[PDB]
From a paper:
Fe(III) complexes of 5-LICAM4−, 6-LICAM4− and 8-LICAM4− were co-crystallized with CeuE and their crystal structures determined. The structural differences can be quantified by calculating the mean planes defined by the six carbon atoms of the two catecholate rings, and measuring their inter-planar angle which is 97°, 111°, 110° and 110° in CFe-4-Lic, CFe-5-Lic, CFe-6-Lic and CFe-8-Lic, respectively. In contrast, the longer and more flexible linkers in Fe-5-Lic, Fe-6-Lic and Fe-8-Lic can adapt to both the geometric requirements of the Fe(III) center and the binding pocket of CeuE. The Kd values of Fe-4-Lic and Fe-6-Lic are similar and lie within three standard deviations of one another. This indicates that the entropic cost incurred upon binding of the ligand with the more flexible 6-atom linker is compensated by its ability to accommodate the preferred octahedral coordination geometry of Fe(III). In addition, the affinities of CeuE for Fe-4-Lic, Fe-5-Lic, Fe-6-Lic and Fe-8-Lic were determined using fluorescence quenching, which yielded dissociation constants of 21 ± 6 nM, < 10 nM, 33 ± 8 nM and 58 ± 8 nM, respectively. The crystal structures of all three complexes show that the siderophore analogues are bound in the Λ-configuration, as previously reported for CFe-4-Lic20, (CeuE)2-[(Fe(MECAM))2]6− 19, FeuA-[Fe(MECAM)]3−, FeuA-[Fe(enterobactin)]3− and FeuA-[Fe(bacillibactin)]32728.
The periplasmic binding protein (PBP) CeuE1 is an important component of the Fe(III) uptake system in Campylobacter jejuni, a commensal Gram-negative bacterium in the avian gut, but a common source of food poisoning in humans. CeuE, an integral part of the CeuBCDE ABC transporter of C. jejuni, is responsible for capturing Fe(III)-siderophore complexes in the periplasm for delivery to their respective inner membrane transporter. C. jejuni does not itself synthesize siderophores, but capitalizes on their secretion by other bacteria, such as E. coli. Here we report a combined solution and structural study of a series of synthetic tetradentate analogues of the enterobactin-derived bis(2, 3-dihydroxybenzoyl-L-Ser), to explore the ligand-binding promiscuity of CeuE, both wild type and with mutations of the Fe(III) binding residues H227 and Y288.
Residue numbers in the entry: 22 to 255, 257 to 310
């Protein structure tokens, strides 16, 4: 279990511990650079857009184009450190993609880690949202939003077929890899109750290498596809999965090859009030 975010009220600020370290963070930071696209969407959901002074515009999702106003701090894998310095932020918010540059970032300004725990998605998700909301006095609003998300989870959990199995896959160039429970997309199995065609897929950040022979041998009832091409600006998932083998699966037969929106699933990783809700609905609409 990843250490949670913990905070102590210091009057004009909070003293804040997370899994990478500790920071004094002002109440109401007014100049926040945000490198997690999920948190950006939480900032939008809580009407905190004017607090955001820089975003990774090379990877700004279509669903967050209201932020194309903001100065750019590069990409999520290509941080523009000079632009971050030059903006003189009072807070920087990162997740897993920037952990290795923690120290550089913290030299510049207080740097908060809001990564998701793959083994405890929901508790880490609520902890991230609330920790952010608490900086602004908005815990009440945030908890209401979270409670709405949980009604969706409970509903979605109910319309679930106990006898059908899913495979989660990610496509990239002409390469497929597999994800299962406890992975960066595990909410599908771990939270929404959809069974896994294969319980022993080793968790890895960009998945474990497979091919279409594997997909047909497993013969899942659903295939959830996350097309990383779209994120990288590349060809498409429909290409590599247009083959005779995939076409024979139960998932093809029953029109359950579901292309998940990668901006939400890959980039945001469901780490926001908006993305997570949309993602619950997407799965719910794709499986009923
Ligand atoms: O540490 C990470 N990546 C290091 C960069 C090595 C990846 C090579 C190419 N990646 C990309 O160009 C890329 C671009 C945008 C978003 C991404 O995730 C990407 O991997 C990382 C961490 C959590 C989740 C990810 O997914 C990551 O990668
Ligand atoms: Fe990546």
């Amino acid at each position: 279990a990843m250490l949670p975010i913990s905070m102590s009220d210091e009057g004009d600020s909070f003293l804040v511990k997370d899994s990478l370290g500790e920071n004094k963070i002002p109440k109401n930071p007014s100049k926040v650079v945000i490198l997690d696209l999920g948190i950006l969407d939480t900032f939008d959901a809580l009407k905190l857009n004017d607090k955001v002074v820089g975003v990774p515009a090379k990877n700004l999702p279509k669903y967050l184009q209201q932020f194309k106003n903001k100065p750019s701090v590069g990409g999520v894998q290509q941080v523009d450190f000079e632009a971050i310095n030059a903006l003189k932020p009072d807070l920087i918010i990162i997740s897993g993609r920037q952990s290795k540059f923690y120290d550089k970032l913290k030299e510049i300004a207080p740097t908060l880690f809001v990564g998701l725990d793959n083994a405890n998605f929901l508790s880490s998700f609520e902890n991230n949202v609330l920790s952010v909301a608490k900086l602004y006095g908005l815990e009440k609003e945030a908890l209401e939003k979270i409670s709405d998300i949980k009604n969706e989870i409970e509903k979605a959990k109910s319309i679930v077929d106990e006898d059908k199995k899913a495979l989660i896959i990610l496509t990239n160039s002409n390469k497929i890899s597999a994800f299962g429970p406890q992975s960066r997309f595990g909410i599908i199995h771990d939270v929404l109750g959809i069974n896994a065609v294969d319980e022993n897929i080793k968790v890895g950040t960009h998945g474990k290498s497979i091919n279409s022979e594997f997909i047909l041998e497993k013969n899942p009832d659903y295939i959830f596809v996350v097309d990383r091409n779209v994120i990288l600006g590349n060809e498409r998932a429909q290409g590599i999965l247009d083959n005779a083998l995939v076409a024979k699966t139960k998932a093809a037969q029953n029109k359950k090859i579901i292309y998940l929106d990668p901006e939400y699933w890959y980039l945001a990783s469901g780490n926001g009030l908006e993305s997570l809700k949309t993602m619950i609905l997407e799965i719910k609409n794709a499986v009923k």
